[PDB]
Design a protein around this ligand. Structure first.
Ligand SMILES: Nc1ncnc2c1ncn2[C@@H]1O[C@H](COP(=O)(O)OP(=O)(O)NP(=O)(O)O)[C@@H](O)[C@H]1O
Ligand SMILES: [Mg+2]
Lengths: 86, 321
């Protein structure tokens, strides 16, 4: 059978200048010319941007899942607080 | 460069920019067209600078076109306002005809005003068939035509300023093509509202026969143009429009930073929910999803933008190989 390997970048450390390139503004984006890089080292960068987008998007969803539970928990307390009055 | 929107309503978007300027959105012919649009030096004509190798760069006029001002205030223009604009419009139309050019467009939308109120012509070298409300009969019939083809359009335009729409506006355009050459000259829908000077000026502009149609220079000596007031009378309507334009920009960004307080509290601390009214708690739960897809969308739209120049570069290299 065929075995596809886990993502190679989960273990490879991500250079800090590229995290700066992701936090950079919409404006300063073409500032960097990529033609000088080789075709293969450039593959090893766009993939780390996906991995960063994922770590960044996971944090977004978790925050909203927590805020969702916090809201639903408190709303259950206002409900139980109310019944206890009547 | 990159600044905000101005409109479209015709071809493509036109944008504002600082380098202040404005920009609009077979090649060797395009190049010589702008190259000749640059030779124009008149205070009654929008100045063209360059064309980014098509993206065009032109002078920025802060009050917009008289068309935008009519739509923003929801008011047509009175008679003194028209006469003042048309005088400045006719000058510079005289100028283009001096340089043996024909504007060929001309409509409330291509008459631009600076904040001082100076009207300036725009869009001459940037125009199976299109809308022919402002076109003269001979231009429609593809008979030959000369400089006074603009004068017909000027008459149609002055009706547009006075009533908010050109003649035949409500009709299907493809019907107008064949009604304009045949039917007699258009007139005002309520002639009694307008003076003898204005109606006669439009009567001299809308002569179906071009050889009996007034020229730019001749119309500069018309009573309707002589009683024209200084550019200072346009100051109030320019202030009205600029305030309406500004007030919706405030409503747009006040309603934008309003949605900012439905996003998740950044510190991750949700103990404060004890201080909210049940109704406020319901509202946040409800807004939760619409705001999460907003954050997520603005996340991918940023990352596919940071990630593309990398991909675009790998693509050129594979071709070279
Ligand atoms: N130099 C400029 N300064 C300010 N606003 C401008 C300028 N040029 C164009 N605009 C705006 O652009 C809007 C739309 O222009 P445009 O895309 O040319 O369509 P249009 O003028 O209505 N018809 P057309 O000129 O034939 O393409 C107008 O309503 C103006 O307010
Ligand atoms: Mg225009």
């Amino acid at each position: 059978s065929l075995l596809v390997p886990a993502n190679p970048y989960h273990t490879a450390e991500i250079p800090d200048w590229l995290q700066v390139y992701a936090r950079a503004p919409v404006k300063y984006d073409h500032i960097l010319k990529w033609e000088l890089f080789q075709l293969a080292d450039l593959d090893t960068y766009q993939g780390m941007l996906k991995l960063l987008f994922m770590k960044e998007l996971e944090q977004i969803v978790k925050m909203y899942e927590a805020y969702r539970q916090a809201l639903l928990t408190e709303l259950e307390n206002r409900k139980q607080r109310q019944q206890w009055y009547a | 460069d990159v600044l905000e929107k101005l409109g479209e309503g015709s071809y493509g978007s036109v944008f504002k920019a600082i380098h202040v300027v404005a920009i609009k959105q077979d090649l060797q012919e395009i190049i010589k067209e702008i190259s000749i649009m640059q030779q124009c030096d008149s205070p009654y004509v929008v100045k063209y600078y360059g064309s980014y190798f098509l993206w065009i760069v032109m002078e920025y006029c802060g009050a917009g076109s008289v068309s935008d001002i009519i739509r923003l205030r929801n008011k047509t223009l009175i008679e003194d306002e028209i006469a003042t604009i048309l005088k400045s419009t006719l000058k510079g139309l005289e100028y283009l005809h001096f340089m043996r050019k024909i504007h060929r467009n001309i409509k409330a939308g291509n008459i631009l005003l600076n904040t001082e109120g100076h009207a300036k012509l725009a869009d001459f070298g940037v125009a199976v068939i299109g809308t022919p409300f402002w076109m003269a009969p001979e231009v429609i019939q593809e008979i030959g035509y000369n400089c006074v083809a603009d004068i017909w359009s000027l008459g149609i335009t002055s009706i547009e300023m006075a009533e908010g729409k050109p003649p035949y506006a409500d009709i299907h355009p493809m019907r107008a093509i064949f009604m304009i050459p045949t039917n007699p000259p258009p007139t005002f829908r309520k002639p009694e509202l307008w003076s003898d000077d204005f109606t006669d000026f439009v009567k001299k502009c809308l002569v179906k026969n071009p050889e009996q149609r007034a020229t730019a220079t001749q119309l500069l000596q018309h009573p309707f143009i002589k009683n024209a007031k200084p550019v200072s009378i346009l100051r109030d309507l320019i202030t009205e429009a600029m305030e309406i334009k500004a007030k919706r920009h405030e409503e747009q960004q006040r309603e934008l930073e309003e949605e900012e307080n439905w996003k998740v509290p950044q510190d991750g601390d949700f103990d404060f929910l004890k201080n909210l009214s049940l109704e406020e708690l319901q509202m946040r739960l409800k807004a939760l999803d619409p705001m999460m897809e907003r954050e997520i969308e603005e996340l991918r739209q940023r990352y596919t933008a940071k990630r593309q120049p990398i991909l675009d570069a790998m693509d050129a290299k594979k071709r070279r190989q």
